[PDB]
Design an enzyme around this catalytic site. Structure first.
Site, PDB file in Angstrom:
ATOM      1  N   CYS A 188      18.098  92.800  14.274  1.00  0.00           N
ATOM      2  CA  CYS A 188      17.062  93.678  13.813  1.00  0.00           C
ATOM      3  C   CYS A 188      15.859  93.817  13.882  1.00  0.00           C
ATOM      4  CB  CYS A 188      17.861  94.941  12.735  1.00  0.00           C
ATOM      5  SG  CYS A 188      17.067  97.082  12.994  1.00  0.00           S
ATOM      6  N   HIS A 196      24.616 101.845   8.337  1.00  0.00           N
ATOM      7  CA  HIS A 196      23.769 102.635   7.816  1.00  0.00           C
ATOM      8  C   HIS A 196      23.727 103.479   7.502  1.00  0.00           C
ATOM      9  CE1 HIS A 196      24.574 102.295  12.344  1.00  0.00           C
ATOM     10  NE2 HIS A 196      23.377 103.090  12.556  1.00  0.00           N
ATOM     11  N   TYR A 223      18.988 105.010   9.168  1.00  0.00           N
ATOM     12  CA  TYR A 223      18.287 104.660   8.794  1.00  0.00           C
ATOM     13  C   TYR A 223      18.528 103.475   8.228  1.00  0.00           C
ATOM     14  CZ  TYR A 223      14.115 106.770  10.211  1.00  0.00           C
ATOM     15  OH  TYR A 223      13.920 107.998  11.601  1.00  0.00           O
ATOM     16  N   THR A 224      18.672 102.122   7.356  1.00  0.00           N
ATOM     17  CA  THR A 224      19.263 101.193   6.492  1.00  0.00           C
ATOM     18  C   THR A 224      18.296 101.889   4.988  1.00  0.00           C
ATOM     19  OG1 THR A 224      20.017  99.787   7.987  1.00  0.00           O
ATOM     20  CG2 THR A 224      20.346  99.705   4.859  1.00  0.00           C
TER      21      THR A 224
HETATM   22  C1  LIG Z   1      19.960  99.650  12.611  1.00  0.00           C
HETATM   23  C2  LIG Z   1      18.732 100.356  12.016  1.00  0.00           C
HETATM   24  C3  LIG Z   1      18.478 100.475  10.666  1.00  0.00           C
HETATM   25  C4  LIG Z   1      16.712 100.771  10.240  1.00  0.00           C
HETATM   26  N1  LIG Z   1      16.216 101.303   8.582  1.00  0.00           N
HETATM   27  C5  LIG Z   1      15.086 101.741   8.833  1.00  0.00           C
HETATM   28  C6  LIG Z   1      14.157 101.505   7.925  1.00  0.00           C
HETATM   29  O1  LIG Z   1      14.930 100.891   6.570  1.00  0.00           O
HETATM   30  N2  LIG Z   1      12.843 102.775   7.903  1.00  0.00           N
HETATM   31  C7  LIG Z   1      12.368 103.024   9.012  1.00  0.00           C
HETATM   32  O2  LIG Z   1      11.257 103.141   8.920  1.00  0.00           O
HETATM   33  N3  LIG Z   1      12.928 102.320  10.328  1.00  0.00           N
HETATM   34  C8  LIG Z   1      13.592 101.850  10.399  1.00  0.00           C
HETATM   35  N4  LIG Z   1      14.629 102.365  11.477  1.00  0.00           N
HETATM   36  C9  LIG Z   1      14.097 102.936  13.070  1.00  0.00           C
HETATM   37  C10 LIG Z   1      14.147 104.334  13.075  1.00  0.00           C
HETATM   38  O3  LIG Z   1      15.495 103.893  13.104  1.00  0.00           O
HETATM   39  C11 LIG Z   1      13.123 104.693  14.168  1.00  0.00           C
HETATM   40  O4  LIG Z   1      13.434 103.694  14.971  1.00  0.00           O
HETATM   41  C12 LIG Z   1      12.087 104.882  13.473  1.00  0.00           C
HETATM   42  O5  LIG Z   1      11.794 105.529  12.183  1.00  0.00           O
HETATM   43  C13 LIG Z   1      10.738 105.526  14.604  1.00  0.00           C
HETATM   44  O6  LIG Z   1      11.399 106.542  14.623  1.00  0.00           O
HETATM   45  P1  LIG Z   1      10.485 107.633  15.087  1.00  0.00           P
HETATM   46  O7  LIG Z   1      11.187 109.132  15.760  1.00  0.00           O
HETATM   47  O8  LIG Z   1       9.960 107.577  13.615  1.00  0.00           O
HETATM   48  O9  LIG Z   1       9.697 107.193  16.294  1.00  0.00           O
HETATM   49  P2  LIG Z   1       9.794 107.635  17.843  1.00  0.00           P
HETATM   50  O10 LIG Z   1       9.357 109.362  18.941  1.00  0.00           O
HETATM   51  O11 LIG Z   1      11.721 107.294  17.853  1.00  0.00           O
HETATM   52  O12 LIG Z   1       9.418 106.155  19.066  1.00  0.00           O
HETATM   53  C14 LIG Z   1       9.535 105.337  17.760  1.00  0.00           C
HETATM   54  C15 LIG Z   1       8.160 104.278  18.642  1.00  0.00           C
HETATM   55  O13 LIG Z   1       7.355 104.729  19.222  1.00  0.00           O
HETATM   56  C16 LIG Z   1       6.111 103.779  19.576  1.00  0.00           C
HETATM   57  N5  LIG Z   1       5.236 104.644  18.645  1.00  0.00           N
HETATM   58  C17 LIG Z   1       4.656 105.824  18.092  1.00  0.00           C
HETATM   59  N6  LIG Z   1       4.251 106.093  17.617  1.00  0.00           N
HETATM   60  C18 LIG Z   1       3.318 104.902  17.411  1.00  0.00           C
HETATM   61  C19 LIG Z   1       1.485 104.271  16.542  1.00  0.00           C
HETATM   62  N7  LIG Z   1       1.272 105.824  15.806  1.00  0.00           N
HETATM   63  N8  LIG Z   1       1.957 103.129  16.511  1.00  0.00           N
HETATM   64  C20 LIG Z   1       2.621 102.372  17.418  1.00  0.00           C
HETATM   65  N9  LIG Z   1       3.884 102.379  17.720  1.00  0.00           N
HETATM   66  C21 LIG Z   1       4.290 103.763  18.007  1.00  0.00           C
HETATM   67  C22 LIG Z   1       6.894 102.570  18.660  1.00  0.00           C
HETATM   68  O14 LIG Z   1       7.618 101.332  20.428  1.00  0.00           O
HETATM   69  C23 LIG Z   1       7.742 103.014  18.055  1.00  0.00           C
HETATM   70  O15 LIG Z   1       8.602 101.930  18.069  1.00  0.00           O
HETATM   71  C24 LIG Z   1      16.125 101.877  11.958  1.00  0.00           C
HETATM   72  C25 LIG Z   1      16.506 101.280  12.883  1.00  0.00           C
HETATM   73  C26 LIG Z   1      18.217 100.659  12.692  1.00  0.00           C
HETATM   74  C27 LIG Z   1      18.810 100.669  14.027  1.00  0.00           C
END
Ligand SMILES: Cc1cc2nc3c(=O)[nH]c(=O)nc-3n(C[C@H](O)[C@H](O)[C@H](O)COP(=O)(O)OP(=O)(O)OC[C@H]3O[C@@H](n4cnc5c(N)ncnc54)[C@H](O)[C@@H]3O)c2cc1C
Length: 271
Positions: free
Chosen positions: A244, A48, A64-65
């Site tokens: 995942c 990723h 992100y993948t």
């Molecule tokens: C190997 C891998 C690949 C990934 N590929 C993708 C991809 O292709 N696309 C993708 O979108 N993500 C992907 N993810 C997830 C990504 O890494 C993030 O966790 C995701 O984008 C959320 O990050 P954030 O900073 O926006 O939210 P953060 O600030 O990190 O917090 C997100 C978390 O807060 C909570 N949360 C916040 N707002 C809400 C809401 N409105 N409703 C419910 N819960 C909420 C949930 O627990 C959520 O998981 C991948 C993760 C991994 C490990």
């Protein structure tokens, strides 16, 4: 042999956003321009990238993948679930990176880095898994691959499924079990069911839902021992199990029940 975007993993590469596609209220495909139309990204299957930005004074990094592959010249596509603010009562500020992506205007850059991850799919059943970032990869060749995904956890699996599916001499069978909260939250469903229609001999597809609709032919509830025994390859096939999804699903719903079914910890890999 095209030019590679990610030439070293220690460099951050600012890529311009060139398109936005609204898929649903909270899901979106973002396209970024690679440095030239004749560039590829340079992302081994199974690995990723990381996006990084300074948000409200804090460095924020998230993996992100991409939905695209090293077969795609000039661009990278990411499919993003946007966690909006003032939507879920427990998480009032929303998601940091995903709202930053949603707020980007066409022509803004954001930093990519990679490739990253401890698993690389080397093709035709061979997976190369390092136990840590400094140890060398152990090679395991498998007949079948179990796949448990939750939420955006599907894109690591899609990358591997499509990689297998497009090699006619790759006979690895993928068994996917795809968990989400409600039916609207099933990401990339048209794609997954297209692969089912065209590749069902090598791809088995099952879903489950925390809160299933009344008309639902698949699983209801969290991933359990029965769905793992029913919709993932049996331990006696020595399959690799790929995972995942949200940490709670991994910790409470997958790992314990994979152990109860009999999948050895070394054949279980958490993206
Ligand atoms: C190997 C891998 C690949 C990934 N590929 C993708 C991809 O292709 N696309 C993708 O979108 N993500 C992907 N993810 C997830 C990504 O890494 C993030 O966790 C995701 O984008 C959320 O990050 P954030 O900073 O926006 O939210 P953060 O600030 O990190 O917090 C997100 C978390 O807060 C909570 N949360 C916040 N707002 C809400 C809401 N409105 N409703 C419910 N819960 C909420 C949930 O627990 C959520 O998981 C991948 C993760 C991994 C490990």
């Amino acid at each position: 042999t095209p030019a590679i975007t990610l030439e070293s993993p220690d460099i951050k590469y600012p890529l311009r956003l060139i398109d936005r596609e609204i898929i649903s209220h909270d899901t979106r495909r973002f396209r970024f321009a690679l440095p030239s139309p004749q560039h590829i990204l340079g992302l081994p299957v199974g690995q990723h990238i990381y996006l990084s930005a300074r948000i409200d004074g804090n460095l924020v990094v998230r993996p992100y993948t991409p939905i695209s592959s090293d077969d795609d010249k000039g661009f990278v596509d990411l499919v993003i679930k946007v966690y909006f603010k003032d939507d879920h009562p427990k998480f009032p500020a929303g998601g940091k990176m995903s709202q930053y992506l949603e707020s980007m205007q066409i022509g803004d850059t954001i930093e990519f880095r990679g490739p990253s991850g401890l698993l690389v799919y080397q093709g035709k059943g061979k997976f190369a898994i390092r136990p840590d970032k400094k140890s060398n990869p152990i090679i395991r060749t498998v007949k079948s691959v179990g796949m448990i995904a939750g939420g955006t956890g599907i894109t690591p699996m899609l990358q591997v499924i499509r990689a297998i599916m497009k090699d006619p001499d790759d006979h690895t069978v993928c068994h996917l079990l795809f968990a989400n909260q409600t039916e609207k939250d099933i990401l990339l469903r048209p794609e997954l069911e297209e692969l089912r229609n065209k590749h069902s001999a090598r791809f088995k597809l099952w879903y489950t839902l925390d809160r299933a609709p009344e008309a639902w032919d698949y699983g209801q509830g969290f991933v359990n021992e029965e769905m793992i025994r029913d919709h993932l390859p049996p331990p006696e096939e020595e399959p690799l199990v790929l995972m995942c999804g949200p940490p709670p699903m991994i910790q409470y719903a997958c790992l314990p029940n994979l152990d109860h079914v009999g999948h050895p910890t070394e054949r279980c890999f958490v993206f």
